[PDB]
Amino acid sequence: EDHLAKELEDLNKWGLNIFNVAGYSHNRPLTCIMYAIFQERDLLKTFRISSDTFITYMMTLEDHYHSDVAYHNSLHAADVAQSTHVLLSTPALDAVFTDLEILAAIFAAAIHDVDHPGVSNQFLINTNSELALMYNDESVLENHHLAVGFKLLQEEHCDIFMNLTKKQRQTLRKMVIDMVLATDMSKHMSLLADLKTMVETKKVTSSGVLLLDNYTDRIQVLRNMVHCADLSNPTKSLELYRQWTDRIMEEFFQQGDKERERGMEISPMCDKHTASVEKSQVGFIDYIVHPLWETWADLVQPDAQDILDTLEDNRNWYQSMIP
Ligand SMILES: COc1ccc([C@H]2CNC(=O)C2)cc1OC1CCCC1
Ligand SMILES: [Mg+2]
Ligand SMILES: [Zn+2]
Q: What is the resolution of this structure in A?
A: 2.3
Question: How large is the angle between the packed helices 140-152 and 51-63, nearest 10 degrees?
Answer: 150
With CA atoms as reference, report the closest residue to 112 among 51, 34, 191. Answer: 34
**Domain edges within the chain:** 1-323
- Strand partners of residue 204: 210
- Beta-carbon contacts of residue 177 (< 8 Å; ≥ 6 apart): 146
Distance 77 CA to ligand 3 centre (A): 7
Query: Cis omega before residue 323 (within 30°)?
Result: no
Experimentally determined by: X-ray
Calpha distance 3→19 (Å, rounded): 12
Q: Which among 77, 66, 1 is positioned nearest to 37, based on CA atoms?
A: 77
- The span from the CA of 223 to the CA of 179, in Å, is 5
| Ligand 1, pocket-test mutation among 69, 71, 80, 280, most atoms within 8 A of CB | 71
Q: Which residues contact 118 (CB under 8 A, 6 or more apart)?
A: 66, 68, 69, 70, 71, 72, 251, 254, 255
In this structure, which residues have their CB less than 5 angstroms from ion ligand 3? 113, 230
Q: Which residues are catalytic?
A: 72
In CATH, what number does 1-323 get? 1.10.1300.10
